Amino acid sequence: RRGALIVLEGVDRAGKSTQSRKLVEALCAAGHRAELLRFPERSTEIGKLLSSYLQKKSDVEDHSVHLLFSANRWEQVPLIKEKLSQGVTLVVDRYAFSGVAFTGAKENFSLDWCKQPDVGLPKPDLVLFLQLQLADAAKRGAFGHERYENGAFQERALRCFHQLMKDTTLNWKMVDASKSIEAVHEDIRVLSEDAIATATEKPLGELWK
Amino acid sequence: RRGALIVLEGVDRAGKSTQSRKLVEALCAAGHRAELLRFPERSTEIGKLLSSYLQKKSDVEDHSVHLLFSANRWEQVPLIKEKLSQGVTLVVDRYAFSGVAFTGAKENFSLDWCKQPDVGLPKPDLVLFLQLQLADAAKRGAFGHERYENGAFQERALRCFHQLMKDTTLNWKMVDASKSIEAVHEDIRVLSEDAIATATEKPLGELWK
Numbered sequence A, B: 001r002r003g004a005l006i007v008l009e010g011v012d013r014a015g016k017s018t019q020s021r022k023l024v025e026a027l028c029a030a031g032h033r034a035e036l037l038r039f040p041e042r043s044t045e046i047g048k049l050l051s052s053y054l055q056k057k058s059d060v061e062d063h064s065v066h067l068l069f070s071a072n073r074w075e076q077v078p079l080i081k082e083k084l085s086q087g088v089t090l091v092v093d094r095y096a097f098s099g100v101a102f103t104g105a106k107e108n109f110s111l112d113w114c115k116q117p118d119v120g121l122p123k124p125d126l127v128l129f130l131q132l133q134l135a136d137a138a139k140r141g142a143f144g145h146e147r148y149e150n151g152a153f154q155e156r157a158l159r160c161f162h163q164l165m166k167d168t169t170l171n172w173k174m175v176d177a178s179k180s181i182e183a184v185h186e187d188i189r190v191l192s193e194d195a196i197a198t199a200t201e202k203p204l205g206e207l208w209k
């Protein structure tokens, strides 16, 4: 009985990381075997290049960096497939969608080109998109000092997210992340239990193919 | 008056590296400004990952390694465009075609998926393909100890090369690499002078788009 592949995507400061952590804790407390993953995974060789780039410690050509972000997902696919096959549900803080939305927010990058490297990755059984008005996001802190942490660029990434959400091949669920941490969590946890029950019924899919 | 982008591709031991070196020397001796490049470019961070992989010092997931090879070309695009715009002809030992042919020789990799990461790279004005019968290749030494240096895999890569050569958007020229080093060189040098003269007439193209 395979585990589910659940991805959290969402706007800046909507709570992807907080909710991914809380979801894994709650699933495990409820007898599920669940584990957390995140992208970029900064621990690998490629992950360290990505981390240096995001911290502005290095500059990386845009196409190159896009492919490294994708390669960073592919290097974890053997682990991902192994875990799901063993019945372990995986909760993932950002995935290919952030990949496309962030590079797609740059000039002269078509969504089509941005999606290709990730075509064929393990397909999420559930993609949660945590929405929050910018006025509310602003109350959660200031912008970070990392790359891409500015409103103008975040807004172009958001437009790319909205295009990706028109894709009906994917089980997208909108989450109102403006509520309290606990309330948001309970909405996510219930959607997640539902997806875990049904994932055991159909084989793990392939993204964008 | 822009320089030309000339790529050498070809079967194992056909002489890509010898002929790329000799071509640059001859062009420069004939008053052209020409410089040599090669892929993979093993000097960069990504290049070092690629080098370790090819030497079998590390294993890398197939999709990941494919994207690193492509990223390794993209990180040199700013240099490539800068040089060509300054009138410098670039002679390149392997390019995106080796990228697709080598990954495409592996099980479950479509040519379409393999090509996508390289879509949009600087388009070569001339792609030389050095052909040689395997009996002749065998006389040029033994196989190397690096990855992919075995006849069965080389033969599947060759089939992918033949599919890529049906692409009429590209200026493919077959070279009979079974001749002497000097004879092969003179065939390549003449094709190259012709392409250099005409490249100054049309803008640098985009590959596979």
Ligand SMILES: Nc1ncnc2c1ncn2[C@@H]1O[C@H](COP(=O)(O)OP(=O)(O)O)[C@@H](O)[C@H]1O
Pocket: A010, A011, A012, A013, A014, A015, A016, A017, A018, A019, A140, A141, A177, A178, A179, A180, A181, A184
């Ligand atoms: N629902 C929420 N309400 C109020 N503050 C929140 C909420 N979710 C997260 N936060 C706070 O907002 C900040 C951003 O949360 P984080 O989970 O790191 O977001 P993301 O990973 O989406 O950038 C953290 O300080 C966190 O405690």
Ligand SMILES: Nc1ncnc2c1ncn2[C@@H]1O[C@H](COP(=O)(O)OP(=O)(O)O)[C@@H](O)[C@H]1O
Pocket: B010, B011, B012, B013, B014, B015, B016, B017, B018, B019, B140, B141, B177, B178, B179, B180, B181, B184
């Ligand atoms: N036309 C040729 N005839 C005979 N030997 C050749 C010829 N071209 C190259 N060689 C030799 O064959 C070997 C492979 O050449 P190399 O240029 O390194 O090939 P590639 O880069 O295609 O693998 C080298 O030892 C080289 O001297």
Ligand SMILES: Cc1cn([C@H]2C[C@H](N=[N+]=[N-])[C@@H](COP(=O)(O)O)O2)c(=O)[nH]c1=O
Pocket: A012, A039, A040, A054, A069, A070, A093, A094, A095, A096, A098, A099, A100, A102, A103, A147, A148, A149
């Ligand atoms: C997974 C992924 C993230 N990103 C970005 C989104 C984030 N930048 N912002 N804002 C950045 C850091 O991610 P976190 O916000 O999850 O820490 O990486 C990409 O650009 N491509 C990708 O493939």
Ligand SMILES: Cc1cn([C@H]2C[C@H](N=[N+]=[N-])[C@@H](COP(=O)(O)O)O2)c(=O)[nH]c1=O
Pocket: B012, B039, B040, B054, B069, B070, B093, B094, B095, B096, B098, B099, B100, B102, B103, B147, B148, B149
């Ligand atoms: C440029 C490139 C080369 N390769 C391979 C071809 C070669 N392996 N063999 N045989 C390897 C080393 O290249 P040289 O043969 O040019 O040294 O890299 C890829 O797999 N992908 C690529 O994108």
Ligand SMILES: [Mg+2]
Pocket: A016, A017, A018
């Ligand atoms: Mg986060």
Ligand SMILES: [Mg+2]
Pocket: B016, B017, B018
């Ligand atoms: Mg060589």
Ligand SMILES: [Mg+2]
Pocket: none
């Ligand atoms: Mg396509």
